[PDB]
Design a protein around this ligand. Structure first.
Ligand SMILES: *[C@@H]1O[C@H](CO)[C@@H](O)[C@H](O)[C@H]1NC(C)=O
Ligand SMILES: *[C@@H]1O[C@H](CO)[C@@H](O)[C@H](O)[C@H]1NC(C)=O
Ligand SMILES: *[C@@H]1O[C@H](CO)[C@@H](O)[C@H](O)[C@H]1NC(C)=O
Ligand SMILES: *[C@@H]1O[C@H](CO)[C@@H](O)[C@H](O)[C@H]1NC(C)=O
Lengths: 48, 144
């Protein structure tokens, strides 16, 4: 029965705030539909 | 078997069920109040993951010592306010205690209604300072 420990930082831009909760039926289920986009950081190299 | 449910001090937000069918699809929840006091619970037998994320924007927190960057720009054809052509120049330096730095990525967001100069980007490329350029979704990425 755990609460959610959320605290928006001070000096925050008004209107830009969203609280999301993600649930998965399997432990390794989240990295399935986002395989092309595991990370928002851009690509461009061989290791990337 | 899993049944999960979220509560606030005013009511129950969500009541979801996880079973053999509901195993590979992700469940999305969005809190209507961003500063509330919520509590989740999962009941049943098995193993599950819970993720809680907060998304916001901050106004360029350049107040502490960090990987030093100083960005500015100049105009050349300034006319009646808005200038048709802009010239962006940035300065980068490293101030950490590490031995030596690795490859770095610089991202510049376009100033609202503008677009990249492809000849300028390719001139930067053929000059030997940036090994890769990229432009997409009004962000220009240079890989140093
Ligand atoms: C989590 O709880 C701590 C109290 O131990 C609090 O200082 C913090 O602001 C809360 N939120 C985050 C995101 O750490
Ligand atoms: C179990 O999940 C199914 C999915 O449709 C649905 O009947 C309901 O959400 C759950 N049933 C329960 C908790 O009895
Ligand atoms: C929210 O609920 C928590 C539960 O422990 C408690 O701090 C209090 O009842 C509420 N806090 C508020 C309304 O700031
Ligand atoms: C870090 O490692 C480098 C070797 O690459 C060498 O200069 C020294 O052993 C270390 N310290 C500094 C300040 O570079």
């Amino acid at each position: 029965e755990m609460p959610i420990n959320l605290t928006l930082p001070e000096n925050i831009v008004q209107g830009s705030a969203s609280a999301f909760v993600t649930f998965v039926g399997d432990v390794l289920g989240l990295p399935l539909s986002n395989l092309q986009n595991l990370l928002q950081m851009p690509y461009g190299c061989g290791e990337q | 078997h899993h049944n999960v449910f979220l509560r606030s001090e005013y009511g129950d937000v969500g009541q979801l069920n996880l079973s053999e069918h509901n195993r590979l699809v992700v469940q999305r929840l969005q809190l209507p109040e961003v500063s509330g006091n919520y509590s989740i619970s999962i009941n049943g037998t098995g193993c599950c993951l819970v993720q809680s994320t907060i998304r916001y924007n901050i106004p360029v927190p350049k107040e502490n010592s960090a990987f030093y960057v100083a960005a500015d720009s100049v105009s050349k054809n300034c006319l009646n306010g808005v200038a048709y052509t802009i010239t962006i120049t940035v300065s980068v330096s490293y101030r950490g205690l590490r031995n030596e730095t690795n490859m770095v990525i610089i991202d510049i967001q376009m100033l609202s209604g503008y677009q990249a100069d492809y000849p300028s980007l390719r001139q930067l490329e053929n000059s030997q300072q940036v090994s890769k350029t990229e432009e997409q979704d009004n962000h220009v990425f240079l890989y140093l």
